[PDB]
Design a protein around this ligand. Structure first.
Ligand SMILES: [Fe+3]
Ligand SMILES: [Fe+3]
Ligand SMILES: [Fe+3]
Ligand SMILES: [Fe+3]
Lengths: 189, 189
């Protein structure tokens, strides 16, 4: 069955450490706030936000092993940036360890690192909450916060654009889910 | 059989018009020059460069119809930027109308608009020649020309980066082949 809130918080503090656990509470609170604005279920928002980073502190090799063992097919393109995953590994832990069965919550956890095409409202909220939670501080966090409060799709687009430019600037790999997520928003806009 | 050079030039002038035909001769000459630098076959370079834009002046709807009729499966992601495709339609015309059978030449024509992972030397030469042919003039064309003369992979990477940033800036769609082409170069670098 599903773990109690208190059992979950114990598990997250143990696995994530103080700083990342505090981040997670911030994401939770932010997800709940956005849920209020957009009429999303508050408890779906609270649980997905709370547990979204449950696999964050695992080594990439272990993340890959968890995903592979549970039946997910990963390609070389998924393995080469193993950081990214922690969303899928987190979905797996949320389902198999924590006992969370809600499909929307599991998707929101899975795709929070990259986004994807045709995201649910909950998926969007969890994705953006990670960027705008109160504990975050970076150039432009404010416009992003404003946009999230008014026009969620705009906020995601702004985030995707920033990510892609940053990766280009750093010479890193670009994940297809992020590219496809952005295209999908442009085509609906 | 394959058309004579003179028949090809007649066809290109008629179909492309003066300005775009002149561009094509520039690409041809540039491809030949780069072929000399990199030890690629000069006649493969000359024909691919000459005919690469043979389908450029067709309407997008007709480009799509040519590709579909000849058996290529196009997705919504291919159709939404139909401009791009003219490479595949050009490959089809080069094979079925002009009588060009060389697989490498056909690939170089097909992928000149986007690039792709694991390009041949000829594919790379045709792709970059389009950007650096003498008739071109834009911010940074010079560094691109320098890089092409010394480090072809560097030049492509620079081009892909520029394209992606430009599309983001303009709010357009990003084609998976360009993203995948860039990732492939980063992973070999
Ligand atoms: Fe995360
Ligand atoms: Fe996070
Ligand atoms: Fe072209
Ligand atoms: Fe061209």
């Amino acid at each position: 069955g599903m773990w109690s809130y208190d059992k979950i918080t114990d598990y997250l503090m143990n696995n994530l450490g103080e700083k990342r656990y505090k981040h997670s509470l911030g994401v939770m609170d932010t997800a709940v706030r956005l849920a209020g604005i957009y009429n999303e279920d508050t408890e779906k928002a609270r649980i997905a936000g709370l547990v979204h980073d449950c696999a964050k502190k695992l080594p990439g090799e272990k993340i890959i092993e968890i995903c592979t063992n549970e039946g997910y097919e990963l390609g070389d393109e998924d393995i080469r940036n193993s950081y990214l995953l922690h969303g899928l590994a987190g979905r797996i832990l949320a389902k198999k360890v924590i006992g969370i069965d809600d499909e929307d919550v599991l998707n929101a956890i899975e795709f929070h690192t990259t986004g994807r095409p045709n995201m649910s409202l909950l998926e969007k909220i969890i994705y953006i909450a990670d960027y705008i939670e109160p504990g975050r501080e970076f150039k432009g966090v404010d416009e992003l916060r404003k946009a999230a409060d008014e026009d969620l799709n705009k906020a995601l687009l702004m985030s995707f654009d920033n990510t892609i430019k940053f990766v280009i600037d750093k010479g890193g790999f670009l994940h297809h889910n992020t590219i496809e997520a952005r295209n999908y928003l442009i085509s609906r806009k």
